[PDB]
């Protein structure tokens, strides 16, 4: 008896990349299932006995160390933000991204991006800190939305404002960062550059200034980029589905919790 599509879906939940196992081998479902459950339980037991770190938390800590060591100030800003910030980002009620916003009250929303809060920090810190101003944030962002898109994800955004805000310097920070993480990439590109892993977008990056700056009281050169942490994990651990890298009750470090 061939496996049913339902059975195949069930085994794929339990399959980790590099199991080196085939599902067209003439072994019954119940036995293939039992083998995989066994391995996945062992994977959790090993994490529990040895490291005990969540991949998303650990990646955040590794990224944080990278940027702190390179001169960037760690920011932790509100996740719940004024709706007015979305309009001031130039996102009108007719825009597709406007339909993607999770509204909370009359006046607030879950941030879909880190830029508005970072804009405010750039303007404020420019009164206190020497040139250039270098900051970053890592945290939750939200968009109503795929095997590449989550509704609840985690962004890194870094930026620099003042001197040294060139395309060359932006590409160099991106290059050092991803070679540090061990992630293969290419950069394709007032500029806008995309950092790609094959067909998967890891980042959009920007060389300012841009006209939007003035709405935020910013009038200096700047560079920046945003990376999705779940996308980075997906590539690093070779997950077939990005849900394996997300905040979840169904997966822990890419291992099914439904055992
Ligand atoms: C003061 C300015 C600061 C500054 O830093 N400016 C330049 C920042 C670049 C602008 C940039 N930060 C931006 O505007 O969101 P975008 O939709 O482009 O997404 C950026 C990345 O987030 C990830 N990502 C986005 N949506 C996702 C989803 N639904 N699921 C998973 N990952 C996702 C993915 O890795 C994507 O490439
Ligand atoms: Mg983009």
Author numbering: 188 to 332, 335 to 378, 385 to 454
Task: Tell me what the authors wrote about this structure, in their words.
For instance, a direct link between activation of gene expression through crotonylation of Lys on histone H3 has been demonstrated. Using an evolved PylRS (L274A C313A Y349F) from M. barkeri ε-N-crotonlyl-lysine was introduced into histones. All four adenylated amino acids occupy the same space in the active site of the aaRS domain. Thus more space and a higher degree of flexibility is possible and not all atoms of the methylene spacer carrying the functional group are fully defined in the electron density. Our data show that analogs containing only the peptide-bond motif, can efficiently bind to the active site of the wild type PylRS. Thus Kalk, Kbu, Kcr, and Kpr are recognized as substrates and fit well in the pocket. The data were processed with XDS to 2.05 Å (Kalk), 2.28 Å (Kbu), 2.15 Å (Kcr) and 2.2 Å (Kpr) spacing, respectively, ensuring consistent indexing and choosing the same set of free reflections.
Here we present the X-ray crystal structures of the PylRS from M. mazei in complex with adenylated Kalk, Kbu, Kcr and Kpr. Taken together this provides insights into the plasticity of the active site of this enzyme and shows that non-natural amino acids with certain key features can be readily incorporated.
